[PDB]
Design a protein around this ligand. Structure first.
Ligand SMILES: CCCCCCCCCCCCCCCCCC(=O)OC[C@H](COP(=O)([O-])OCC(O)COP(=O)([O-])OC[C@@H](COC(=O)CCCCCCCCCCCCCCCCC)OC(=O)CCCCCCCCCCCCCCCCC)OC(=O)CCCCCCCCCCCCCCCCC
Ligand SMILES: CCCCCCCCCCC(CCCCCCCCCC)(CO[C@H]1O[C@@H](CO)[C@H](O[C@@H]2O[C@@H](CO)[C@H](O)[C@@H](O)[C@@H]2O)[C@@H](O)[C@@H]1O)CO[C@H]1O[C@@H](CO)[C@H](O[C@@H]2O[C@@H](CO)[C@H](O)[C@@H](O)[C@@H]2O)[C@@H](O)[C@H]1O
Ligand SMILES: CCCCCCCCCCC(CCCCCCCCCC)(CO[C@H]1O[C@@H](CO)[C@H](O[C@@H]2O[C@@H](CO)[C@H](O)[C@@H](O)[C@@H]2O)[C@@H](O)[C@@H]1O)CO[C@H]1O[C@@H](CO)[C@H](O[C@@H]2O[C@@H](CO)[C@H](O)[C@@H](O)[C@@H]2O)[C@@H](O)[C@H]1O
Ligand SMILES: CCCCC/C=C/C/C=C/C/C=C\C/C=C\CCCC(=O)O[C@H](COC(=O)CCCCCCCCCCCCCCCCC)COP(=O)(O)O[C@@H]1[C@H](O)[C@H](O)[C@@H](O)[C@H](O)[C@H]1O
Ligand SMILES: CCCCC/C=C/C/C=C/C/C=C\C/C=C\CCCC(=O)O[C@H](COC(=O)CCCCCCCCCCCCCCCCC)COP(=O)(O)O[C@@H]1[C@H](O)[C@H](O)[C@@H](O)[C@H](O)[C@H]1O
Ligand SMILES: CCCCC/C=C/C/C=C/CCCCCCCC(=O)O[C@H](COC(=O)CCCCCCCCCCCCCCC)COP(=O)([O-])OCC[N+](C)(C)C
Ligand SMILES: CCCCCCCCCCCCCCCCCC(=O)OC[C@H](COP(=O)(O)OCCN)OC(=O)CCCCCCCCCCCCCCCCC
Ligand SMILES: CCCCCCCCCCCCCCCCCC(=O)OC[C@H](COP(=O)(O)OCCN)OC(=O)CCCCCCCCCCCCCCCCC
Ligand SMILES: CCCCCCCCCCCCCCCCCC(=O)OC[C@H](COP(=O)(O)OCCN)OC(=O)CCCCCCCCCCCCCCCCC
Ligand SMILES: CCCCCCCCCCCCCCCCCC(=O)OC[C@H](COP(=O)(O)OCCN)OC(=O)CCCCCCCCCCCCCCCCC
Lengths: 469, 91, 179, 486, 90, 89
């Protein structure tokens, strides 16, 4: 039903004016909500890990992928509410947070390309869908074209995505040159013994992984995440991560991988010690993505990782989405707005935040202790259930390096708190205009999932016991 | 120039490596060069119509992989919408 | 049991490998740099990388093989001594004594903690929980690693802990019986 | 419907007291004082004749996520007490109003924040002693640290920032390896539980690994010599209630965790390692109590004193003796009485008045404050191991139990009676005597609230000192429980 | 052209309350002394005296008390004793 | 496999060591894609199937749309800055 949305939408956007664009996104927001509500019941198809293959050995549908599908729709309902709703009714925030005409077009085409990977069985479905989502990230980066940094970032992202698309294509055709086959379904655990498919499947994994931000090739993605504006970057950070990783976690082609294990160690090291002496908030906030994409590369080495993965996915997605939404709200309280596309940059700009909207600091605290892994919060059971899979399966040096990486990464997480709970000379006493009710309810909902979401751990596991076993 | 020469040697040899499946690394490379045997082409009279190659592509793009043609239509659509949407400057 | 090592053979193999890694990293340092650089500044403005790779390789594998040969067993301590030698080579580049002592002690402790977990980045297949016998013993047997029981043999307690402290081969009660 | 209507009534009453009174601190005192009444009524209905866990309740079960659960299958979070838990709960709950009392006039700017954080920390360390899973012990073991970080950072000395960092850093960094060990237990046994876990036996090579991860966390939290490092600065730059709740309750929480978590299922490990614990225990009694002598600051001395007393405490725990276990409990409870009174004397009566904690300013406090000097001496002598105070009962039975297990470690462990007296009386005679200081202008005598806190925290040492049998009715099961003498 | 909005009216932050008069004449020498003593670790450097104390208290003393502790595990009972009865197990 | 691998490796190194302009980087990308095509088309001919020819005729179109998209990205890059640098973006 994304197809019908795109086909209806681009015809509808061709006829609307510029001033209509905002309200169009509101429509699409509600549309996606009634694809969650009125169409969820398809989970009843997937009892006892019954898997389907649709369109003839082409798309594989299990309930792992159904959950990834539902997660991607939920986060788009959020991101679409960020574009489609005003923050305040000022003359300021209309020229700072304003959608383009064709923005929601590229959004839905991107989600289409990201779903056709997690649902994918074939390799040409994999390649066409990676190409579709890669074009969409090209154009979502370059759509705010009256910005020097965003155009430079779109060009950088074009060439570095072109190399790692031709590396994937070379790995697919290298796999074809030794097996007249397109599926990893053909592998079926006898062939891997008598066939040297190490170097092929590992090179395929790498060419898929370097697009995430794994650490030998991590600098260019941190540059794109700092150069893009503040609304584009909470989408292009989240979507290729969860799409490409839930591809590679579903098909288990790097087990006992020594190369994935080196790159997981190297990722947890230079992500935690990378973002220490840094002063820009999107930088600081983009090396948090490097370490938390490091905790996934561990699970690639695993067999049977579908609990640790999915729980830590929706953990990172809610925590991610919430900490980006908080520093949208701190823009009213800063004393200095530069750079219209990216209005808050330096992390010392949110300094007096406890004396002006103290419960924004309560919100910020609750989400940032969840990144560290504090046990009343939902981030801790995510790190816990990763640890239960790492220690089960023989990765003992990986585990202590995970722990040292978590301890180093707590420093620049707590730097946000250190800066936020400080004295400020000039405090706000009263504000005329207040924040959007339907948009601040989303942040309150995203906290109450993080705070009081350890409640349902038991229920989820029992539901997890039925539909995946 | 020195990283050029090192990468020429390594990337060339290692591109020639994965066409082969001995566990020993030197036996992987030499199987790249043992091609001088001439394949024998035999005439089989089993085919009755001039299905060319383009006919078979049009049968497999359209029945077995029709969805790939249709997702490909979405990609061609994107290749229209994108360059336009950048280079408009609406109003 | 074990097999002794060829210190000279493994040392010269590692010396060739460290020479190769030094040449590759020197070329990568030239080509990723600024300023006037030519073909001959590979080993001129090298920053001394080939000495790093060469000394670290030779010292680690020579101390590892020598410590494994004089102890006549292979465990995690040999990685500690070899990592101490690696820290000695890396710490002599900073020509200071307390620096040098710190590099030796902390690199040896980190490499010993590495070599004690198996000295492997990846996993071991037979040793992990998932591929090993677990749970209770089904009948009475030698309780292997990863297995739980209810009662342990007391002869094993005397053999493993000792015959001393509060621990005896006979409980203190029936050692003091009226007949 | 009934227990929901109680909460819908009490939250409404809370909102109304907020709307009419700006502070809450009256309602917080009222709530914590009611918690006292409730826990002592639980003490009346407590059966001492059963080793059992008497008052059990499950939270967050599958079939009932919001509330109590009566099902044949349990995967939530278990809670309940024996005697051993309940003693600390008593020592917990009578401390909680006093810290809520302890800052009744100091905090002026943001009252409701500070009193909410202090009461919330106290409630979390209430529920620490109720827990029965390994995970439900550990979830609340680390619920404290955000509240402690926010408390130490916002309020404190000029150096609030570094102290709040260290109380996150070292405490976290030890607790992570504790979590490693908890995970390794939870994937072998497939059950975290404080009930069954003495029944299971692990391999000696497998107990050998698990025990290091728990023991280095207890090394961090009862600060033994390798990491005894955050303790003086997180005291010396804390506010008052954070320092009291820390040194009265968090250190005794890790003294409880070495009993509850390690001594039941690491027994055959634990015998092989008692000399390593005795190395570190003697070496943290000698070398921290010797570093007390060279101190310029005044709250820092009472901090290192707490290190030396916990170093005495843990060699009764690992003593494999009835005497040592009972002496460690009576030391832990009596130090939880006597030590927050000392942090009051340095922090409440002496930092609220002069706002500088350097020792060199303070001389001759007797001639302008006689009854403060009276306190300073009788709380000094109660700290050392001067008897009829309960601190000596803990020190004596702990040194005796440590002399059982190894006599030569007890011989040099016994000189702690000397080393604990040297710095404490060296501080006491500098504060008590001399001509009154030219730097200090004369201020008020000790007020009624401070004398109230002091009188309670001194009677409660003297009752345990005159008769330590008053709480043997809880422990006589749990003194026999942890002993492994085949 | 981007300035934070006009409807702020932000005011100064006090800490509130009563100006408690100075009960203490601070000494410059004592304050500089104590600030030097608490922050000693940021100017600490290794010398021969540091090496001597770091050798003897962190390495030599744990090894000595270690050897004494591991030798004397199950040697001594004195629990019920007699003349002519050895008290060492060994 | 020699012609496709040599076109791919030489085009890849010419892309990497490009410091002179940007249109050489685009055309090195397209010559890479040609090399991957050549390797696959030969593998289709040697294995007697259209299967790799199916992946070939799809990746022809995807190389096309990659050119169209990315050259519009370059026109967007050039719109604000009336010259393209020699050293790169
Ligand atoms: C995260 C990990 C945390 C765990 C370790 C805890 C930290 C230890 C202390 C660190 C420290 O003090 O550094 C200060 C030191 C400070 O630098 P500085 O400003 O030049 O000197 C000022 C100091 O005050 C120096 O002046 P000074 O006179 O006061 O002190 C002399 C000495 C003092 O340092 C000491 O602590 C030595 C004294 C200890 C004796 C104690 C004996 C009893 C125990 O300082 C040093 O030079 C130390 C250099 C050794 C660094 C060791 C790094 C080990 C690698 C960790 C792997 C992860 O740090 C560095 O020199 C940085 C060097 C560059 C980083 C090196 C990282 C590369 C790692 C390569 C891989 C190594 C092998 C890994 C294992 C491979 C297999 C898996
Ligand atoms: C919390 C503080 C931090 C502690 C870090 C932990 C790391 C401690 C590692 C200890 C541990 C994992 C257990 C850890 C589980 C808890 C993990 C806690 C958290 C993890 C972060 C890895 O043990 C490693 O020890 C190393 C040396 O010590 C060895 O190094 C290497 O040596 C050379 C040999 O070939 C290599 O060739 C060389 O390449 C290396 O030099 C490795 O062989 C070995 O894998 C033990 O595993 C092993 O124990 C043995 C017993 O003997 C078990 O055999 C059992 O017993 C026998 C019949 O009784 C029978 O043989 C068998 O029938 C039975 O199976 C195994 O089952 C196995 O499982
Ligand atoms: C047995 C002997 C072994 C040799 C070691 C002694 C060692 C290491 C001790 C570290 C212990 C590690 C702890 C780990 C624990 C073990 C598990 C202590 O070296 C220190 O010794 C001290 C005392 O002798 C000096 O302190 C103060 O000095 C005066 C300043 O005013 C005061 O007069 C004095 O009162 C202070 O005390 C220091 O200056 C000196 O660095 C190193 O000594 C050696 O290293 C070098 C590097 O520095 C020294 O520096 C040189 O000095 C410059 C001019 O000085 C030169 O320009 C320069 O060429 C060079 O840099 C050498 O001299 C040499 O000696
Ligand atoms: C971009 C543009 C396109 C460019 C094209 C030109 C080149 C393309 C090639 C590059 C492709 C991308 C490169 C990717 C990195 C290489 C990835 C790679 O090494 O996998 C290696 C192949 O093990 C060789 O035996 C590998 C040996 C290979 C021989 C080395 C090269 C020879 C050079 C001669 C001088 C395997 O990993 P792995 O950890 O799972 O393998 C382990 C372990 O090694 C085994 O012991 C275990 O048995 C096995 O189960 C597994 O656990
Ligand atoms: C498993 C977990 C998975 C998902 C759970 C997530 C969300 C729960 C799902 C649905 C939650 C549904 C909520 C609908 C009811 C919530 C609700 O009271 O209305 C809104 C927000 O309404 C959403 O913001 C509606 C936005 C819904 C989007 C939620 C996405 C997050 C809050 O009232 P409000 O006083 O601020 O609204 C008033 C009033 O309506 C106006 O007349 C006034 O003029 C104005 O001042 C305004 O303040
Ligand atoms: C009328 C329909 C209402 C529309 C509901 C739409 C929800 C979209 C949201 C997606 C992400 C939010 C997390 C949802 C968790 C579902 C768990 C599940 O059940 O997941 C299980 C297993 O999960 C996993 O592996 C681990 C995921 C763990 C989630 C961690 C977050 C916990 C806190 C939030 C959950 C509790 C909040 C309840 C508040 C009252 C399989 O998924 P399933 O196939 O059983 O899907 C169920 C079909 N349901 C949605 C229609 C019922
Ligand atoms: C002949 C056969 C025998 C010899 C074969 C040995 C091959 C070893 C090759 C290693 C070469 C060293 C890699 C290298 O060149 O690094 C240089 C590059 C930039 O470093 P540079 O600019 O020179 O120094 C600046 C310091 N800030 O640094 C880089 O950014 C390159 C990225 C790292 C190289 C990939 C290695 C991945 C493995 C990481 C190790 C993690 C270990 C985890 C434990
Ligand atoms: C708060 C911060 C908390 C930090 C906690 C410390 C983290 C670790 C710091 C670095 C420790 C470095 C450890 C060096 C030990 C190196 C080693 O190889 O140990 C090997 C040793 C023998 O093990 P094995 O090979 O099985 O032989 C059996 C013979 N009985 O294995 C052993 O016997 C155990 C030796 C380690 C003893 C404990 C070390 C301190 C913990
Ligand atoms: C934020 C950190 C993460 C939080 C994870 C843990 C969440 C804790 C949430 C607080 C709620 C727990 C306390 C209330 C649950 C117990 C209420 C109860 O009814 O206990 C039932 C128990 C037996 O009752 P029953 O079996 O039904 O039979 C009755 C026959 N007369 O009756 C009894 O045995 C008496 C039980 C006494 C319980 C005393 C607990 C002391 C602390 C109470 C306040 C706790 C609030 C802490 C808030 C901070 C959050 C940690
Ligand atoms: C980071 C910080 C995280 C903070 C974490 C705090 C966790 C708080 C979760 C509270 C859940 C635990 C509730 C304790 C149970 C006490 C109770 O029994 O309440 C009554 C009712 C269920 O009662 P029932 O199951 O019928 O058993 C009675 C038998 N005599 O219970 C109920 O009806 C539930 C009423 C409480 C609902 C509160 C929901 C959250 C509030 C925000």
């Amino acid at each position: 039903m994304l197809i019908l949305a795109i086909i209806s939408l681009i015809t509808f956007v061709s006829m609307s004016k510029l001033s209509d664009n905002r309200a169009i996104i509101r429509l699409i927001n509600i549309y996606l909500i009634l694809v969650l509500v009125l169409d969820s019941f398809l989970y009843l198809l997937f009892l006892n890990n019954q898997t389907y293959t649709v369109m003839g050995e082409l798309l594989i549908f299990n309930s792992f992928t159904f959950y990834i599908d539902m997660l991607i729709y939920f986060i788009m309902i959020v991101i679409s509410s960020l574009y489609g709703y005003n923050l305040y009714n000022n003359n300021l925030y209309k020229t700072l947070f304003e959608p383009k005409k064709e923005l929601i077009i590229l959004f839905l085409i991107n989600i289409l390309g990201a779903l056709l990977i997690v649902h994918s069985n074939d390799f040409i479905t994999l390649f066409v869908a990676i190409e579709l989502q890669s074009y969409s990230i090209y154009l979502i980066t370059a759509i705010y074209n009256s910005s020097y940094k965003a155009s430079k970032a779109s060009m950088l992202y074009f060439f570095m995505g072109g190399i790692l698309s031709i590396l994937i294509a070379y790995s697919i055709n290298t796999y074809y040159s030794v097996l007249n086959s397109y599926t990893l379904h053909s592998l079926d655990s006898l062939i891997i013994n008598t066939l040297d498919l190490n170097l092929i499947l590992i090179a395929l994994s790498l060419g898929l992984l370097f697009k995430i931000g794994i650490a030998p090739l991590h600098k260019w993605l941190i540059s794109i995440y700092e150069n893009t504006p503040i609304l584009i970057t909470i989408y292009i950070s989240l979507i290729p991560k969860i799409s490409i990783l839930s591809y590679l976690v579903l098909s288990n082609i790097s087990i006992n991988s020594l190369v994935i294990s080196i790159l997981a160690i190297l990722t947890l090291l230079v992500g935690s010690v990378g973002g220490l002496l840094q002063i820009k908030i999107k930088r600081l906030l983009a090396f948090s993505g490097l370490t938390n994409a490091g905790y996934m590369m561990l699970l690639l080495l695993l067999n049977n990782n579908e609990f640790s993965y999915l729980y830590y996915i929706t953990q990172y997605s809610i925590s991610h989405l919430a900490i980006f939404m908080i520093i949208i709200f701190s823009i009213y309280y800063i004393n200095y707005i530069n750079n219209q596309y990216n209005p808050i940059i330096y992390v010392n700009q949110l300094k007096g935040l406890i004396h002006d909207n103290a419960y924004l600091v309560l919100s910020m605290a609750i989400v940032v202790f969840s990144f560290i892994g504090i046990p009343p919060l939902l981030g801790f059971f995510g790190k816990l259930n990763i640890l239960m899979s790492i220690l089960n399966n023989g990765y003992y040096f990986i585990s202590i390096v995970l722990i040292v990486a978590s301890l180093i990464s707590a420093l620049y997480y707590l730097y946000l708190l250190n800066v936020s709970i400080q004295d400020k000379n000039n405090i706000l006493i009263n504000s005329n205009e207040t924040v959007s009710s339907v948009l601040s309810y989303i942040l309150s909902s995203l906290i109450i999932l993080i705070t009081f979401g350890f409640i349902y751990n038991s229920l989820i596991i029992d539901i997890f016991n039925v539909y995946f076993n | 120039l020195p990283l050029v020469l090192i990468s020429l040697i390594v990337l060339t040899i290692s591109g020639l490596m994965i066409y082969s499946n001995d566990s020993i690394l030197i036996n992987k490379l030499l199987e790249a060069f043992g091609n001088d045997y001439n394949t024998i082409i035999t005439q089989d009279w089993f085919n009755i119509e001039n299905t060319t190659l383009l006919t078979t592509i049009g049968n497999v793009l359209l029945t077995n992989n029709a969805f790939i043609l249709l997702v490909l239509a979405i990609v061609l659509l994107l290749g229209i919408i994108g360059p336009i949407s950048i280079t408009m400057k609406h109003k | 049991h074990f097999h002794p090592y060829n210190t000279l053979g493994l040392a010269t193999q590692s010396a060739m490998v460290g020479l190769g890694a030094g040449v590759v990293a020197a070329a990568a340092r030239n080509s990723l740099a600024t300023g006037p650089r030519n073909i001959l500044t590979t080993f001129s403005k090298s920053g001394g990388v080939v000495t790093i790779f060469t000394g670290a390789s030779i010292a680690y594998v020579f101390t590892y093989c020598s410590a494994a040969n004089l102890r006549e067993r292979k465990d995690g301590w040999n990685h500690m001594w070899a990592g101490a030698a690696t820290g000695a080579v890396l710490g002599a580049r900073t020509k200071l004594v307390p620096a040098f002592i710190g590099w030796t002690v902390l690199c040896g402790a980190a490499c010993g903690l590495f070599g004690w977990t198996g000295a492997r980045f990846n996993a071991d297949r037979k040793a992990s929980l998932e591929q090993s016998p677990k749970g209770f013993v089904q009948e009475d047997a030698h309780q292997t690693f990863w297995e739980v029981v209810h009662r342990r043999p007391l002869s094993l307690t005397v053999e493993q802990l000792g015959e001393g402290r509060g621990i005896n081969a006979v409980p203190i009660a029936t050692a003091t019986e009226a007949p | 419907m009934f227990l929901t209507s109680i909460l819908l009534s009490s939250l409404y009453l809370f909102n109304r007291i907020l709307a009419w009174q700006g502070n809450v601190k009256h309602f917080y005192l009222f709530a914590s004082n009611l918690l006292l009444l409730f826990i002592v009524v639980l003490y009346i209905n407590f059966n001492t004749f059963s080793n059992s866990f008497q008052f059990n309740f499950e939270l967050f079960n599958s079939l009932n996520p919001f509330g109590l659960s009566n099902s044949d299958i349990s995967n939530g979070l278990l809670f309940g007490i024996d005697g051993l838990s309940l003693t600390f709960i008593l020592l917990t709950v009578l401390l909680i109003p006093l810290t809520l009392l302890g800052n009744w006039y100091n905090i002026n700017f943001n009252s409701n924040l500070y009193y909410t954080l202090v009461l919330a920390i106290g409630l979390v360390i209430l529920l620490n002693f109720w827990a029965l899973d390994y995970i439900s012990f550990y979830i609340l073991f680390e619920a404290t640290l955000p509240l402690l970080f926010i408390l130490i950072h916002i309020y404190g000395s000029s150096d609030s920032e570094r102290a709040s960092f260290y109380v996150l850093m070292f405490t976290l960094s030890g607790s992570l390896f504790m979590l490693l060990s908890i995970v390794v237990i939870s994937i072998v046994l497939n059950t975290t539980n404080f009930i069954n876990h003495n029944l299971f036996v692990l391999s000696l090579d497998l107990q050998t690994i698990i025990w290091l991860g728990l023991f280095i966390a207890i090394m961090v939290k009862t600060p033994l010599f390798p990491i005894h490092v955050w303790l003086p600065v997180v005291h010396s730059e804390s506010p008052l209630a954070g320092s009291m709740i820390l040194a009265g309750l968090i250190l005794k929480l890790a003294l409880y965790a070495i009993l509850r978590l390690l001594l039941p299922l690491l027994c055959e490990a634990q015998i092989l390692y008692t000399p390593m614990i005795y190395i570190i225990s003697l070496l943290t009694i000698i070398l921290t109590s010797l570093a007390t002598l060279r101190q310029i600051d005044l709250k820092v001395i009472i901090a290192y004193s707490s290190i030396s007393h916990m170093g005495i405490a843990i060699l009764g725990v690992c003593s494999n003796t009835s005497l040592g276990i009972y002496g460690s409990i009576v030391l832990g409870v009596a130090h939880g009485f006597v030590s927050p009174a000392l942090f009051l004397i340095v922090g409440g009566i002496l930092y609220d008045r002069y706002h500088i904690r350097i020792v060199n300013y303070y001389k001759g406090l007797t001639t302008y404050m006689p009854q403060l000097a009276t306190y300073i001496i009788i709380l000094s002598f109660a700290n050392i191991g001067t008897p009829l105070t309960g601190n000596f009962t803990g020190e004596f039975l702990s040194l005796q139990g440590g002399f059982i297990r190894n006599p030569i470690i007890g011989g040099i462990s016994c000189i702690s009676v000397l080393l604990a007296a040297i710095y404490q009386l060296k501080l006491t005679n500098k504060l008590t005597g001399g001509i009154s200081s030219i730097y200090m202008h004369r201020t008020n005598d000790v007020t009624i609230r401070e004398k109230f806190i002091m009188n309670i925290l001194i009677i409660s040492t003297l009752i345990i000192g005159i008769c330590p049998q008053i709480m043997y009715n809880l422990l006589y099961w749990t003194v026999n429980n942890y002993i492994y003498i085949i | 052209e981007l300035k934070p909005s006009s409807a702020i009216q932000r005011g100064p932050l006090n800490k509130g309350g009563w100006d408690a008069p100075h009960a203490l004449h601070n000494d410059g020498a004592i304050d500089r002394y104590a600030h030097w003593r608490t922050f000693y670790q940021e100017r600490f450097k290794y010398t021969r005296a540091t090496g001597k104390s770091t050798l003897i208290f962190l390495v030599a003393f744990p090894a000595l008390i270690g050897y004494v502790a591991y030798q004397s595990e199950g040697l001594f009972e004195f629990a019920g004793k007699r003349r002519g009865e050895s008290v060492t197990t060994r | 496999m020699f012609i496709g691998t040599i076109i791919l490796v030489l085009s890849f190194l010419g892309f990497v060591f490009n410091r002179r302009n940007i249109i050489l980087a685009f055309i090195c990308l397209e010559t890479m894609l040609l090399g991957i095509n050549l390797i696959l088309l030969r593998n289709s001919v040697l294995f007697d199937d259209i299967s790799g020819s199916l992946f070939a005729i799809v990746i022809i179109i995807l190389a096309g749309v990659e050119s169209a998209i990315g050259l519009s990205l370059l026109v967007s890059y050039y719109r604000l800055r009336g010259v393209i640098n020699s050293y790169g973006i």
